Amino acid sequence: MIVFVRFNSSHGFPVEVDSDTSIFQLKEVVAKRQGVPADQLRVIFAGKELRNDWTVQNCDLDQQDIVHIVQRPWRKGQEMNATNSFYVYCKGPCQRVQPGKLRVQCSTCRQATLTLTQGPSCWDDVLIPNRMSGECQSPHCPGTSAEFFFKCGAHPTSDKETSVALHLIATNSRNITCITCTDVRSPVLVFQCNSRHVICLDCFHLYCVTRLNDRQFVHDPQLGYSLPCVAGCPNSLIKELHHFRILGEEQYNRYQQYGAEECVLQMGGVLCPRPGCGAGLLPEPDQRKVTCEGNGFAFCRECKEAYHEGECSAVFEYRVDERAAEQARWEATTKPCPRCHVPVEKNGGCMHMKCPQPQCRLEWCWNCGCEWNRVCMGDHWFDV
Ligand SMILES: [Cl-]
Ligand SMILES: [Zn+2]
Ligand SMILES: [Zn+2]
Ligand SMILES: [Zn+2]
Ligand SMILES: [Zn+2]
Ligand SMILES: [Zn+2]
Ligand SMILES: [Zn+2]
Ligand SMILES: [Zn+2]
Ligand SMILES: [Zn+2]
Numbered sequence: 608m609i610v611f612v613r614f615n616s617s618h619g620f621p622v623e624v625d626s627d628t629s630i631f632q633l634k635e636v637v638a639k640r641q642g643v644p645a646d647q648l649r650v651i652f653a654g655k656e657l658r659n660d661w662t663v664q665n666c667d668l669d670q671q672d673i674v675h676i677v678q679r680p681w682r683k684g685q686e687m688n689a690t691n692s693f694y695v696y697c698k699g700p701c702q703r704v705q706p707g708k709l710r711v712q713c714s715t716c717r718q719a720t721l722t723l724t725q726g727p728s729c730w731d732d733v734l735i736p737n738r739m740s741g742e743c744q745s746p747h748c749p750g751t752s753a754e755f756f757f758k759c760g761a762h763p764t765s766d767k768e769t770s771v772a773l774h775l776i777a778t779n780s781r782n783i784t785c786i787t788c789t790d791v792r793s794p795v796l797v798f799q800c801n802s803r804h805v806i807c808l809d810c811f812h813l814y815c816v817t818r819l820n821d822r823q824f825v826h827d828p829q830l831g832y833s834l835p836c837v838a839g840c841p842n843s844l845i846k847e848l849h850h851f852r853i854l855g856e857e858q859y860n861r862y863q864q865y866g867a868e869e870c871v872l873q874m875g876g877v878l879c880p881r882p883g884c885g886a887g888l889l890p891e892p893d894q895r896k897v898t899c900e901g902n903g904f905a906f907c908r909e910c911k912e913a914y915h916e917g918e919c920s921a922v923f924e925y926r927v928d929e930r931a932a933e934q935a936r937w938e939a940t941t942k943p944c945p946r947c948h949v950p951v952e953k954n955g956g957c958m959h960m961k962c963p964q965p966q967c968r969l970e971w972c973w974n975c976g977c978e979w980n981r982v983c984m985g986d987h988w989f990d991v
Contacts, residue, residue: 609922610668612637613820614676615861618880618911621922624663631659637676641882651675651817654787654837654925671922677816681809687793689778690974692987694794695770696852697759704794704808704853707772708760708985709733713743715750719766723753728955728989730774760985771849775799776808777937777991785810786837786927786935796850800840803937808853810837815854819861822869832865838927861885880911944969945976956989 608626611619614637622636630650638645650657652674657666668674693707713721714737723741727733733755743750757772758764779793785807792807806814814837818824824832827844833851836843845851851862864885868878871887879886879899890897896914898905906912910919941950942960947967951960958973970979974987 608663608668608670610663611671611673611924612676613673613817614641615678615816615820615857615882616880616885617820617822617878619673619924620880620912621920624668626662626664628663629659630657630661630666633663633674634659634676643678647678647680649677649679649681649813651677651813654814654817656788656813671924673924675817675820677813679809679812679816685793687779687782687791689793690987691760691778692989692991693757694773694776695757695759696773696849697761697770698852701759701761702856704773704776705759705761705770706986707770708758708764709988710756710758710766710985712754712756713741713745713748713750714752714754716743716745716748717754718743718745718748720745720748721750721753726957726959726988727755728957730991732989734772734774758985771852773850773853774847775845775850776853779805781937783937784931784934786932787814789928789931789934797937798836798838798840798843799846800836800838800843802836802838802840802932802935802939804836804838804840804843804932805935805937806837812854812858815851815862816858819858819865824862824865826869832862832869838932877908877911880906942973942976945971945978956991958983958987958989 609621609623612622613619624633634645634648638648691706693709694704695707697705712719721741721743723739732739737752739753740751741753756769758768759770775796776794777797779795782791783805784791786804787806787810795805795807796811798804818834825835825844826832833845833848852859868885868887871889876887876889877897881904884899886899888897895908896905897908905914907914910923941952943950944962944967946969947962947964949964951962953973959979960971960973962969972979972983975983
C-alpha cells in the first residue's frame with residue numbers, strides 16, 4: 608500500500624506501508640528521509656491526529672490517501688492557574704508566544720509621564736489609537752492621549768523593545784475544552800465567530816500548517832489570505848494577521864509567500880515539490896521538464912516527482928464534532944480592603960482598585976490583594 612506524505616509542501620511524496628505498519632514506524636521512515644527527529648513529528652489525516660501505537664489498518668488508511676506530517680513537539684508542561692492576562696509574540700530571543708507586559712506612555716512625547724483619567728478595562732482601550740485620555744506631566748507637552756504598548760514578560764526588555772499583542776489568545780481560567788482535541792489547555796486562541804470557539808495553540812499550529820499544505824487559506828479582498836474558525840463558521844476570519852507569526856519563523860515565511868505562490872498558479876504555473884522550497888515557477892505551456900532556477904532539481908510537471916521518461920507512476924494524484932464544538936464556547940461580587948477591611952465594589956474589568964474611605968485611600972490589585980505596583984499593572988491591568 609502507498610500513501611502520500613505532505614511535509615512543508617503542497618505536493619505529497621509517495622511512501623510504501625503495510626496494514627501492520629504503525630504511525631510511529633511511518634514517522635521513523637519520514638524522520639531519516641528528512642533528517643528531523645521522529646519524536647518531533649505529528650501525523651494528520653483529514654484534520655485528525657493519528658497516534659503512534661495505531662497501525663495503518665486501525666487508522667482506516669487506503670491506497671492514494673494523503674497524510675500530513677508537521678514538525679511540532681507536543682509539550683504537556685503548561686500553567687493553568689496563571690495570573691497573566693496578555694500574550695505577545697516575542698520575535699527574539701523567545702521566538703514563541705509568551706506572557707505579555709502592558710505599559711503606557713504619552714502618544715505625543717513617548718514618555719512614561721502621562722497620568723490616565725481611568726485605567727484600561729478592555730482590549731479596545733489598549734488597541735484602538737487615541738481611545739484613552741489623560742494628562743502629560745512633562746513640561747509644556749500638549750499630550751492628552753494615551754499610547755499603550757506590549758513587551759515580552761519572560762525576560763528583561765528595554766522601553767523600545769516592543770512585541771505584537773495577540774488579542775485572540777487568552778489564559779484558560781474558564782477551563783474550556785479545545786474544539787479539535789477536547790483537552791483543557793492554556794493558553795487558548797479564541798476565534799471571532801458567534802459561538803467564540805476555543806482552540807489550543809498546538810491544534811491551531813496543526814490547523815495552519817495542514818491548510819498551508821492543502822492550500823485551503825481563504826482570500827478576503829480587503830484583508831488578504833487568512834483562515835476562519837476550524838468549525839467553518841461564517842464571518843470568523845482572523846483579521847489581525849500577526850496571529851500567524853505564532854507558527855514560528857519557518858511556517859510564517861511560508862504564509863508570507865502564499866500570496867505570491869497563488870498568483871503563479873492563477874496564471875498557469877507550478878510550485879517546487881521539494882520540502883522547504885516553494886518557488887513560483889513559470890515554465891512553457893506544454894513543457895513536462897521543470898527545473899527550480901528570478902534567482903535546484905529537475906521534476907516532472909504531472910506526477911511532481913524527479914524527472915523521468917515515458918508514463919507517470921501508476922500511483923499519482925473535514926467535519927468538527929458537534930459536542931466538542933458546543934463544549935468549546937468561550938462565553939456560552941465584593942472584596943475587602945487589604946488595609947481598611949471595608950468591602951470595595953469592582954467597576955469594569957480594570958484590576959486597579961482604590962479604597963473609598965478618606966483615611967485609607969489604598970491603591971490595590973483586585974486579584975493579588977496587594978498594594979498596586981508595576982508588576983500587577985504589566986501582567987494583569989484588566990481581566991480577560
Ligand atoms: Cl493576549
Ligand atoms: Zn521574549
Ligand atoms: Zn507628553
Ligand atoms: Zn487542541
Ligand atoms: Zn466557530
Ligand atoms: Zn526548488
Ligand atoms: Zn511524471
Ligand atoms: Zn481601605
Ligand atoms: Zn495583581
